[PDB]
């Protein structure tokens, strides 16, 4: 019956701003504390802010890492609630969370005793900072030294990439491994093929790269 | 700030505490979430004994000193997921931190040795001014391990990014690090190590020029 449904997700580059919402239905929102927390992708949960309702003054509070970049505001006739982010950098990619938080409220101690909990959660909404926004891969050769032999994928935007070897004719003992974001915003990723060492140059292994964003084909040759 | 262990293992129907520390735990209570991948958290316990309806019984929160813990008597598979600790960052403090989860892994399949391969720059790739270590890790189970890079033997933490693990197609994880460095830096030294840890067990590959 508790529903939070986020939205406002997308590609923004560093330096650039970007509006999450998130809609509530099913409590009563007027009075409700509400929380942003935050998810880089892999990584664990960061708590980014939480925005009081009109009884406690409209308070708000922000993480040390995101105080003066981010706001937080709400429209209770319209039950939503908004994360402003501005002057966005690449750490804060990109999974982000709006929660129904509670609190515990004692008249003489006031909120200072207790702890905030979040009891229901939205889905989430996955905001991707980055300054490229498309770009082929760079491929390279890892020559064997059982023996292994792949090729790498560096430098690309956006996901995603597919790696095969031969055309299609090799897939026992291959194994693409998941991209990774560098701190710079591209991807790059490894796919190597495991073979017994004296079948090593009898057969010929190419890799075939293909970047469909940036329209980009890449076939490159492995030589021990 | 909130400390977690990583990952814990646990067999089926058996009972597990998955255990949080921090200084703003000796003055405030901690709340315990479980998020799995591509699924909204989860608030399990709350307070010095507040579990929200709809949570089984046999999760439980406890605290002591600057300790909060979260067990889970009779583990079932649906019990595999992350665990998180939120609470105050200092006593009376305004703002919330979480801790840095700990993967609960309920045991479906025996124990596997992590496979490791590490691969030197390639020529090319030097030739661009460009140099990138690659320490490739494959068929390990329960999915998680720890990633040292080593120059020689001193300890190196510039230039390393690690994946998160994730599940192969027979049932295991796989995970790749990267280790970049300047085309002078990696002829310098003499040997370049990538160490994966797994279950107490360290395994190591070394490559040279």
């Known amino acids: 019956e508790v529903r939070l449904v986020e939205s406002g997700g997308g590609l923004v580059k560093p330096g650039g701003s970007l509006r999450l919402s998130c809609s509530a239905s099913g409590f009563d929102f007027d009075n409700a504390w509400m929380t942003w927390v935050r998810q880089p992708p892999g990584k664990g949960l960061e708590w980014v802010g939480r925005?009081?309702?009109?009884?406690?003054?409209?308070?708000?509070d922000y993480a040390e890492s995101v105080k003066g970049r981010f706001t937080i505001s709400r429209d209770n006739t319209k039950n939503t609630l908004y994360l402003e982010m501005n002057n966005v950098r690449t750490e804060d990619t990109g999974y982000y969370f709006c929660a129904r938080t509670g609190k515990y409220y004692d008249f003489w101690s006031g909120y200072a005793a207790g702890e905030e909990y979040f009891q229901d959660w939205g889905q989430g909404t996955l905001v991707i900072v980055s300054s490229a926004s498309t770009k082929g891969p760079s491929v390279f050769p890892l020559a064997p030294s059982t023996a292994a032999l792949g090729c790498l994928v560096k430098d690309y935007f956006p996901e995603p990439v597919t790696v095969s070897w031969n055309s299609g004719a090799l897939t026992s003992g291959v194994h693409t491994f998941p991209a990774v974001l560098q701190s710079s915003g591209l991807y790059s990723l490894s796919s190597v093929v495991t073979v017994p060492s004296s079948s090593l140059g009898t057969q010929t292994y190419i890799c075939n790269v293909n970047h469909k964003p940036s329209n980009t084909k890449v076939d490159k040759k492995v030589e021990p | 700030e909130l400390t977690q262990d990583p990952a814990v293992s646990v067999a089926l129907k058996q009972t597990v505490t998955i255990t949080c520390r921090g200084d703003s735990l000796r003055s405030h209570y901690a709340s315990w979430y479980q998020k799995k991948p591509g699924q909204a958290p989860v608030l399990l316990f709350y307070?010095?004994?507040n579990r929200p309806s709809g949570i089984p019984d046999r999760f439980s929160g406890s605290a002591s000193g600057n300790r909060a813990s979260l067990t889970i008597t009779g583990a079932q598979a649906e019990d595999e997921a992350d665990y998180y600790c939120?609470?105050?960052?200092?006593?009376?403090?305004?703002?919330?931190?979480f801790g840095g989860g700990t993967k609960l892994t309920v045991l479906s399949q025996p124990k596997a040795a992590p496979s490791v391969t590490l691969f030197p720059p390639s020529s090319e790739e030097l030739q661009a001014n460009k140099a990138t270590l690659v320490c490739l890790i494959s068929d390990f189970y329960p999915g998680a391990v720890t990633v040292a890079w080593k120059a020689d033997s001193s300890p190196v933490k510039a230039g390393v990014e690690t994946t998160t693990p994730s599940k192969q197609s027979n049932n295991k994880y796989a995970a790749s690090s990267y280790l970049s460095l300047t085309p002078e830096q990696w002829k310098s030294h003499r040997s370049y190590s990538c160490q994966v840890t797994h279950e107490g067990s360290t395994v190591e590959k070394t490559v040279a020029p």
């Open positions: 939120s609470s105050r960052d200092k006593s009376g403090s305004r703002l919330s931190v």
């Open positions: 307070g010095k004994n």
């Open positions: 925005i009081t309702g009109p009884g406690e003054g409209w308070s708000v």
